[PDB]
Curated annotation (Swiss-Prot):
The protein's role, per its UniProt record: Seems to be essential for minus-strand RNAs and subgenomic 26S mRNAs synthesis. Displays mono-ADP-ribosylhydrolase activity. ADP-ribosylation is a post-translational modification that controls various processes of the host cell and the virus probably needs to revert it for optimal viral replication. Binds proteins of G3BP family and sequesters them into the viral RNA replication complexes thereby inhibiting the formation of host stress granules on viral mRNAs.
Known outcome of mutating N27A: Partial loss of mono-ADP-ribosylhydrolase activity; complete loss of ADP-ribose 1'' phosphate phosphatase activity
The record's account of how the chain is modified after translation: Phosphorylated by host on serines and threonines.
Species of provenance: Chikungunya virus (strain S27-African prototype)
Domain comment quoted from the record: In the N-terminus, the macro domain displays a mono-ADP-ribosylhydrolase activity. The central part called, the alphavirus unique domain (AUD) has a zinc-binding function. The C-terminus region, also called hypervariable domain (HVD), is mainly disordered and binds several host proteins. This intrinsically disordered domain contains 2 SH3 domain-binding sites and 2 FGDF motifs necessary and sufficient for the formation of nsP3/G3BP complexes.
Protein name stated in the entry: Non-structural protein 3
Compartment(s) where it occurs, according to its Swiss-Prot or TrEMBL record: Host cytoplasmic vesicle membrane
Section covered of the full-length record: 1334 to 1493 of 2474
Membrane topology, from the record: Peripheral membrane protein
Domain Macro: 4-163
Length: 163
């Protein structure tokens, strides 16, 4: 575990993280995909061997000894708000199980279902609160990666609010 488990946020490419493992915002079919998933494919292509997994689940594949946790958020284009909310919560619970099993002291994590799976809605608060529900009981240092300067500020404020 970490000596004083923390949450942090950085505005940079998750493919350049400084943590002991990465969560991919994966598609269910293990395809290179777009956005975070494409950056992950370019950096850790070996981790997409037999990475296909259903919505609401996480499947870990090693790239050398570096774990890539493929976490499949719902595409809110296809799911109802209610069923999508349930699957998004579930995907983060499966990430917490994997991070615990791996015995890492730190993890790099994107906000699931906030980009091309967002169904055109701002889901910062929804996705972040599901991340917290899952990860609060873990002792890994969690570092959240985002792209947008206004998102960085809002994520930082939500972390600082609980401290
Ligand atoms: O400020 C940035 C945040 C995320 C990125 C990026 C720049 O390049 C690729 O992903
Ligand atoms: O398009 C992106 C690729 C990598 C990223 C990201 C966006 O935000 C964090 O890391
Ligand atoms: Cl970057
Ligand atoms: Cl997404
Ligand atoms: Cl973002």
């Amino acid at each position: 575990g970490a000596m004083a488990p923390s949450y942090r946020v950085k505005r940079m490419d998750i493919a350049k993280n400084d943590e002991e493992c990465v969560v991919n915002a994966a598609n269910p079919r293990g395809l290179p995909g777009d956005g975070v998933c494409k950056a992950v494919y370019k950096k850790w292509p070996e981790s997409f061997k037999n990475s296909a997994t259903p919505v609401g689940t996480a499947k870990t594949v090693m790239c050398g000894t570096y774990p890539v946790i493929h976490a499949v958020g719902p595409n809110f284009s296809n799911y109802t708000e209610s069923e999508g909310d349930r699957e998004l919560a579930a995907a983060y619970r499966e990430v917490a199980k994997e991070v615990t099993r791996l015995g890492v002291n730190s993890v790099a994590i994107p906000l699931l279902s906030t980009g091309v799976y967002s169904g055109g809605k701002d889901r910062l608060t929804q996705s972040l609160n599901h991340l917290f529900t899952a990860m609060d009981s873990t002792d890994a240092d969690v570092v959240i990666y985002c792209r947008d300067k206004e998102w960085e500020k809002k994520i930082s404020e939500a972390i600082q609010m609980r401290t």
